[PDB]
Amino acid sequence: YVITSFQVDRSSEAGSSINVQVTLEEFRFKRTSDPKKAKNANTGTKQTA
């Protein structure tokens, strides 16, 4: 879950404290690696590095 927005305020009431609101949403997420797990990859055309 990633944070998309939050709010902070210090109203006259409840002094010496802060009210906090947060919002989160799901994330449908889908090198040094073992050669046995490696898969053929690509990097496109490349120029002088």
Partner: protein, 156 residues
């Protein structure tokens, strides 16, 4: 300290003079002649977010004046006729003055706010007229030794 008499002469209810339009008013009833009150406070306070206090003076000074009369007084008819005339033409503003005895006084311009309610019963009833006044700041006037006292107060 010991006891002390606040004044020299006693407060006398008949010494309080009420003038509306330019004529003294007679016919008061019960145990309360007039009541003068304001509509809003003089200063409103607001809290801050870090302890500061901000004060704001009020710029409205209207008030109310309740006049208690018997329902056998001619001033009831006077006020009723004035109300009808004001409704017909438009002139509603007349001077109002109250000269208190050993107390604060008033001098401003007033108007008739709300007509009281009659109640015919076994005894003699009471009618209370609400008279609204433009300025409701009470004036020391007769009380002496006020100018010197005012300059005595310190403050910063």
């Amino acid at each position: 300290n010991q006891s002390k008499i606040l004044t020299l002469q006693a407060y006398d209810p008949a010494k309080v003079l009420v003038f509306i339009g330019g004529q003294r008013v007679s016919g008061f009833a019960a145990d309360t002649k007039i009541v003068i009150t304001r509509n809003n406070d003089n200063i409103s306070v607001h809290a801050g977010v870090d302890g500061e206090i901000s004060n704001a003076l009020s710029r409205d000074n209207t008030g109310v004046m309740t006049l208690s009369l018997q329902n056998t007084a001619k001033w009831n008819g006077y006020l009723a006729q004035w109300q009808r005339q004001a409704n017909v033409t438009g002139l509603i503003y007349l001077p109002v003055q109250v000269e208190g005895s050993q107390g604060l006084s008033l001098n401003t311009i007033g108007w008739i706010q709300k007509q009281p309610d009659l109640s015919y019963g076994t005894e003699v009833g009471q009618m209370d007229w609400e008279i609204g006044v433009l300025d409701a700041w009470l004036s020391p006037d007769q009380i002496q030794g006020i100018a010197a006292g005012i300059t005595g107060l310190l403050g910063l």
